[PDB]
From a paper:
The Gag polyprotein, composed of MA, CA, SP1, NC, SP2, and P6 domains, is the sole viral component needed for the assembly and release of an immature virus particle, which is accomplished by the oligomerization of Gag into a lattice structure at the plasma membrane. Cryo-electron tomography (cryo-ET) data has revealed that the immature Gag lattice forms a spherical cage of interconnected hexamers where the CA protein plays a critical role in stabilizing the spherical hexameric lattice before the viral protease cleaves the Gag polyprotein into its individual subunits and maturation occurs. CA is composed of two domains, the N-terminal domain (NTD) and the C-terminal domain (CTD). By contrast, the immature CA hexamer is stabilized by both CTD-CTD and NTD-NTD interactions and adopts a more extended conformation with a six-helix bundle at the base of the CA-SP1 domains, and the immature lattice is stabilized by NTD-NTD interactions that mediate the inter-hexamer contacts.
LEN binds the immature GagCA-SP1 lattice in a novel binding pocket consisting of three different CANTD protomers, two from one hexamer (denoted chain #1 and #2) and the other from a neighboring hexamer (denoted chain #3). This is a unique binding manner compared to that of LEN binding the mature CA lattice, which is composed of the NTD of one CA protomer (chain #1) and mostly the CTD of the adjacent CA protomer from the same hexamer. By contrast, the additional, distinct CANTD interactions in the immature lattice (chains #2 and #3) cause conformational changes in LEN. The unique binding of LEN across three CANTD also suggests that it modulates the NTD-NTD interactions between CA subunits both within and between immature hexamers. The binding of LEN induces a conformational change to the GagCA-SP1 lattice structure, consistent with its multi-protomer binding site. However, an ~8° reorientation of the CANTD relative to the CACTD takes place upon LEN binding, which induces an overall conformational change of the CANTD layer in the immature GagCA-SP1 lattice. By contrast, the interfaces in the CACTD remain unchanged, including the hydrophobic interfaces in the CA-SP1 six-helix bundle, regardless of whether additional binding with BVM occurs or not. Notably, residue R18 mediates the interactions at the juncture of three CANTD protomers and participates in the interaction with LEN, highlighting its key role in LEN binding and lattice dynamics. By contrast, in the immature Gag lattice, LEN engages three CANTD chains, two within a hexamer and one from a neighboring hexamer. This binding mode allows LEN to bind to the immature Gag lattice with a unique mechanism whereby only the CANTD interfaces are involved, independent of the CACTD-SP1 layer of the immature Gag lattice. Since R18 plays a pivotal role in maturation by coordinating the IP6 molecule within the mature CA hexamer, its sequestration by LEN may disrupt maturation.
Numbering used by the authors:
A (entry chain D), B (entry chain A), C (entry chain P), D (entry chain B), E (entry chain C): 11 to 239
The structure:
Amino acid sequence: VHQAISPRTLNAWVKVVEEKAFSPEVIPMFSALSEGATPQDLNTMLNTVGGHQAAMQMLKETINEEAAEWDRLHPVHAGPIAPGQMREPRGSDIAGTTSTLQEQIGWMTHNPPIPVGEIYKRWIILGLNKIVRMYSPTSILDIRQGPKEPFRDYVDRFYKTLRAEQASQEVKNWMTETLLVQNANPDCKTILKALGPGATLEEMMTACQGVGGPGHKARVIAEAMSQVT
Amino acid sequence: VHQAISPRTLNAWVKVVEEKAFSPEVIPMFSALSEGATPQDLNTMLNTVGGHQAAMQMLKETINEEAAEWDRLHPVHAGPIAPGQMREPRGSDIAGTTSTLQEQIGWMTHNPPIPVGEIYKRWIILGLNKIVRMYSPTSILDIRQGPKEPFRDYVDRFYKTLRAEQASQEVKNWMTETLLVQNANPDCKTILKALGPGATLEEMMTACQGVGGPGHKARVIAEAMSQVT
Amino acid sequence: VHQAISPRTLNAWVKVVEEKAFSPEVIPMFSALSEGATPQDLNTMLNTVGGHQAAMQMLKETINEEAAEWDRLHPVHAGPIAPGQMREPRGSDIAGTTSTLQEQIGWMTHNPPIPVGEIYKRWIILGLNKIVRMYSPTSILDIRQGPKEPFRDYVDRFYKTLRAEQASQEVKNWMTETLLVQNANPDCKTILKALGPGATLEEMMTACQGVGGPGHKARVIAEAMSQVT
Amino acid sequence: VHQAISPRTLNAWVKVVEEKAFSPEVIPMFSALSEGATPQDLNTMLNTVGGHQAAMQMLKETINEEAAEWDRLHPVHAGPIAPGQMREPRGSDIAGTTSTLQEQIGWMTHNPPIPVGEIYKRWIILGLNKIVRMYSPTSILDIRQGPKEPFRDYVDRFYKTLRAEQASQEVKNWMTETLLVQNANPDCKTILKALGPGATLEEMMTACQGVGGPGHKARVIAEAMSQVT
Amino acid sequence: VHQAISPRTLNAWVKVVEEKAFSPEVIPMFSALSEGATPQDLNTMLNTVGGHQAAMQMLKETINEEAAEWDRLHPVHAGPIAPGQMREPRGSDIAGTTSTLQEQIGWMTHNPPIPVGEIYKRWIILGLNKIVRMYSPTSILDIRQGPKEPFRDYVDRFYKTLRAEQASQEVKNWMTETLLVQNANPDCKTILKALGPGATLEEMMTACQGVGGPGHKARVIAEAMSQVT
Ligand SMILES: CC(C)(C#Cc1ccc(-c2ccc(Cl)c3c(NS(C)(=O)=O)nn(CC(F)(F)F)c23)c([C@H](Cc2cc(F)cc(F)c2)NC(=O)Cn2nc(C(F)(F)F)c3c2C(F)(F)[C@@H]2C[C@H]32)n1)S(C)(=O)=O
Ligand SMILES: CC(C)(C#Cc1ccc(-c2ccc(Cl)c3c(NS(C)(=O)=O)nn(CC(F)(F)F)c23)c([C@H](Cc2cc(F)cc(F)c2)NC(=O)Cn2nc(C(F)(F)F)c3c2C(F)(F)[C@@H]2C[C@H]32)n1)S(C)(=O)=O
Ligand SMILES: CC(C)(C#Cc1ccc(-c2ccc(Cl)c3c(NS(C)(=O)=O)nn(CC(F)(F)F)c23)c([C@H](Cc2cc(F)cc(F)c2)NC(=O)Cn2nc(C(F)(F)F)c3c2C(F)(F)[C@@H]2C[C@H]32)n1)S(C)(=O)=O
Ligand SMILES: CC(C)(C#Cc1ccc(-c2ccc(Cl)c3c(NS(C)(=O)=O)nn(CC(F)(F)F)c23)c([C@H](Cc2cc(F)cc(F)c2)NC(=O)Cn2nc(C(F)(F)F)c3c2C(F)(F)[C@@H]2C[C@H]32)n1)S(C)(=O)=O
Ligand SMILES: CC(C)(C#Cc1ccc(-c2ccc(Cl)c3c(NS(C)(=O)=O)nn(CC(F)(F)F)c23)c([C@H](Cc2cc(F)cc(F)c2)NC(=O)Cn2nc(C(F)(F)F)c3c2C(F)(F)[C@@H]2C[C@H]32)n1)S(C)(=O)=O
Ligand SMILES: O=P(O)(O)O[C@H]1[C@H](OP(=O)(O)O)[C@@H](OP(=O)(O)O)[C@H](OP(=O)(O)O)[C@@H](OP(=O)(O)O)[C@H]1OP(=O)(O)O
Ligand SMILES: O=P(O)(O)O[C@H]1[C@H](OP(=O)(O)O)[C@@H](OP(=O)(O)O)[C@H](OP(=O)(O)O)[C@@H](OP(=O)(O)O)[C@H]1OP(=O)(O)O
């Protein structure tokens, strides 16, 4: 079509997703970048969202709901071939799963036009609005050790979140060497600080392996009593 | 139709839901606002309920049960076209899922009349009665930290509830400023007050990160023994 | 039918359920009140049981098994119209789900008679016997705080049970004023008594919010040591 | 008629208004949710705005201004219209006040099309932009007692604003419990604090009834003079 | 005709208005008592409301708005009606201002029926809801003297409110003897108490005629300064 997305349009959409994630600003930008686009172009835009797999699953659920709504309003015709005309779209055709680009173009350019692109755009906008309201991406900054969480479990959660984090490898290494010790609970922080700089992750995990164990509990209790007595 | 809901009727229903939520007063108001309305108007009223999604799901379940009951009382005919007459309504037709507005008007104005609007209204009333009896909306005022609940889990619950709360953003900010520290458990509240005013949420979470850990338990036990000795 | 339930019969059944709940005395009364009644009348009696939803679900399950047994023993005929006679009942027809009142009267008054009312009555009697043996209604008197249960969870259980309780509103308020503090665990009961009369529920929950937390445990341990030393 | 508002679209619009009020975010959401909608659908969306009646009146004034502009640009055509042709829309027809849904659909689905829905959407967007720039909703947090304002007048303003506030009834009770005394002027606030907790609204009003009168002025002047010497 | 309001129905509505004023209970009650009634019966019910003329004016405004909306939905035809046919009702006809009882009956008893009574009752319900939400009746208990308000002006406000108050003459006299001095401002209250019991309204007004004047203010400053000396 005339309004097929240009290379700069697609790149702008990619950069919007990468920089803003799913802040409200994503909704206008998508609306502005995808106007006149076929459902195939919209699917191309959706497929370039790296990460946020849970958010994209949420979006797909919303699209399926809206497709079911469309199918409820549009009943399947009683098998009239109508060789002059073409088949009426279904919800899956609007979402582009069961329709080709030629069919979408034909629906968009027919008289009267069926703007399958704009209908799909509204479905996607509903999904994006739901994501913006509900979804919260994981953040490495939010990973803190629980007061009773073993240090190894905390480290596992930290590294899982770090793997999912959007950052360069150097930045992730820097995050490892600051946040991991920073966001440990006080009991493990004391041990890790006493361990000193240059301690490896294995040394750190060995040093905190007994926190919450009977011996460590006895030790800290006895130290507290000695201080207050 | 003559009794189609007016703009003021729809706005009054919206304001009723926003002001009273699902107090018993909702039941008369709905009854008064929806009399003579087609099932399409009733669905329009139901779609304007913002929030209370669990209550609306309960209402939908009740509507489905009543539609099944109607289907049990009304057997589908043995395919008599009856071109002079029209097809008999099903339960989904009364709820408006499988019927159009024209069909609803045709049933409502036929002689003898099938008041699909009134039947659907009674089903909705049953759902509303169930909601009024059972459903309790979440309240930010009810979020209190458990005696052994970690402060971060409490903060997550608080912010989830605040997100679901019906309030302006300034009011939500004021709620964060007061209720969060107010409704923490005594162990965390002692630390939070020791921090003083002006502490951020991150400083507050770091300060309470050790509550329940071995070191904090030893410290408070030692302080108690020193006081009693 | 000649033995259709009278207004006084239905009201007597309602009063029997309200006063006796599902004590064994319910089984004779039902038997006495429902003799000669159609399945329609029996369903009317079953629908007037307010509350005891779990017991009624048990009764429905028993009725379904008995209907399945009837269907096992009665095979569907090989489609003989038999215009002189009527269709043979199925289990669902005896339970009244798939049968109209006219069909039930026709079966009951046919020669030889098929006493669908009496068969359905025996199914209901089996269900009632099962309820009498197994089902135990929830009681506000039985709601007591566990030794380690947080006060807020106990209060939530108490208020849920109170909502399900069969009592006047004034009686429920009196129960709240007596049983809630009466049935708290000793640790919370001490604090609640120290509050004194006139404390609100919010002040009660605040006062017990720390029971089970480290500070409260340190306090009580130190107090016990001081008393024994 | 393919782009009619779905139940989820209308609910999303309602939630947008309830959550964001008239922050700038409302403008993209509206434009995203109303694409291809008829003027009737747009009016339905506008009627679901609960509260903000003054803002809605500003929007209606903007719409009337734009309709007047349209009428100035499009002069009426004297003489009967052609039987095949339809009447040209006026501003009121675009706004949906004097046009039925069928007429709007006919205008939109025509060769060449008159996009009455999109023109009306632009008018509504102008109104929303004016609201976002100028309208400021009343907030209970901004009700402060003036230095010379009688306490009763301040209480009246507080309760009017609280009635207008978008909040649950429990939240409104909490706001009364906190802000009313918190936001009184110092002269009334010292007396209100001297009253002590648990004071009723009538006791608070009678306690502050004399602030500003000759006796209170004489008393405070004498006390200040005694403090000085 | 069949559902015309009985004498007991009218009396029950009168008692409802007198006992509850415009509490929310007025809405279901009016809904129940007015079912099937003609616009003439509804107008009689509305005319039997004694007092609350501001609320009744609000109701009339709402009715006029709803009549205008109905007129917008129902364009005036050329009216070449057959002798058997009858003129289509307008908003004023539904409200009963321009329609006789016979015309309302004819619209209500017609094929297809035009339920003018029920449409009118919905308009009245919208007005009643507006009243319940917004209107607040004047209460003699709320009349308090302002801190700088002249005593004579307070007396005039009190007597105006007392004249408007719904109460027996003996209760009004008791109100005058109880609340007038009670709800005066502290300076006037001090003088009135010094005046002792048995003083008439003229002595009470003369005793407080100088409060806030130069002599009284100078006197109170002198007494306060002497007290703190
Ligand atoms: C060839 C081409 C032109 C095309 C096309 C093309 C065609 C159709 C669809 C599609 C559209 C709508 C539905 Cl409603 C379904 C469906 N409904 S269903 C039966 O329930 O699953 N299935 N499809 C797959 C279908 F149709 F092919 F079968 C779809 C896609 C979607 C676009 C899309 C991505 C998205 F994230 C969320 C959406 F809502 C829609 N892309 C996928 O679906 C693959 N995907 N899915 C998910 C997830 F599940 F996490 F959301 C994820 C992907 C991912 F991209 F890898 C990314 C990590 C996230 N693209 S091109 C140049 O773009 O390559
Ligand atoms: C075009 C128009 C005239 C129309 C129509 C229209 C037509 C039908 C229905 C509908 C009615 C009855 C059933 Cl019994 C089902 C059904 N039964 S089923 C197979 O089990 O799901 N499905 N539907 C969807 C159907 F029919 F379209 F398929 C329905 C709706 C409902 C109205 C409704 C809302 C509601 F809250 C609870 C109800 F009981 C009924 N609205 C929805 O359902 C969408 N919804 N649902 C839910 C939830 F699930 F949480 F309750 C929520 C929504 C929501 F509004 F977003 C809101 C957050 C809550 N509206 S208009 C101007 O209004 O846009
Ligand atoms: C019109 C009329 C003459 C009639 C009839 C009428 C007709 C049939 C049935 C019925 C009978 C037997 C089965 Cl075996 C099923 C079935 N089997 S199934 C597919 O598995 O669910 N469904 N039905 C619904 C059917 F038939 F309509 F489809 C039935 C009922 C039952 C009577 C009944 C009540 C009961 F408590 C326990 C029973 F075993 C049977 N009433 C309901 O069922 C509705 N109910 N259910 C339950 C629960 F689930 F908790 F037990 C509850 C209700 C409740 F009453 F609200 C109450 C809170 C409890 N009444 S009248 C004057 O009485 O109104
Ligand atoms: C039946 C249906 C399909 C329809 C329709 C329908 C049809 C037309 C109109 C309408 C549109 C444009 C103009 Cl320009 C005027 C007009 N211009 S005029 C002569 O100067 O007053 N009048 N109308 C009434 C008309 F047409 F009947 F005459 C309109 C509405 C508006 C939509 C609207 C709402 C709004 F808030 C602000 C707007 F700008 C437009 N809704 C109302 O107007 C009622 N309203 N008004 C106001 C206020 F004044 F405060 F802004 C308020 C309401 C309220 F919603 F109650 C809410 C508290 C606020 N809806 S449905 C399912 O939606 O019910
Ligand atoms: C024969 C008979 C059966 C009849 C009839 C009869 C016929 C019509 C109307 C009427 C109805 C609707 C509108 Cl919309 C207007 C209108 N619209 S308009 C152009 O703007 O003024 N005018 N009317 C007068 C009309 F029609 F004559 F023109 C009406 C009334 C109203 C009923 C009514 C009372 C009410 F309180 C509020 C309402 F909304 C409607 N009663 C009056 O109006 C007189 N009234 N009004 C007001 C007020 F203004 F405060 F609200 C007050 C009165 C009052 F009762 F004195 C009382 C102190 C309050 N009754 S009966 C019983 O008499 O024997
Ligand atoms: O408070 P309690 O309900 O009495 O539970 C405590 C305690 O839990 P707390 O954190 O709440 O104080 C211990 O937990 P830790 O502090 O050591 O993490 C736990 O000890 P363990 O988890 O190491 O087993 C101990 O269990 P126990 O006494 O059996 O060793 C258990 O006490 P009780 O089971 O006796 O209640
Ligand atoms: O008490 P306020 O309401 O705050 O105003 C007072 C004062 O009031 P009172 O006499 O009741 O104490 C005078 O008002 P009136 O005498 O007319 O009643 C006024 O005018 P005068 O100088 O003539 O006394 C005076 O002065 P000004 O308004 O110029 O400030 C002003 O004093 P303050 O504002 O400083 O309190």
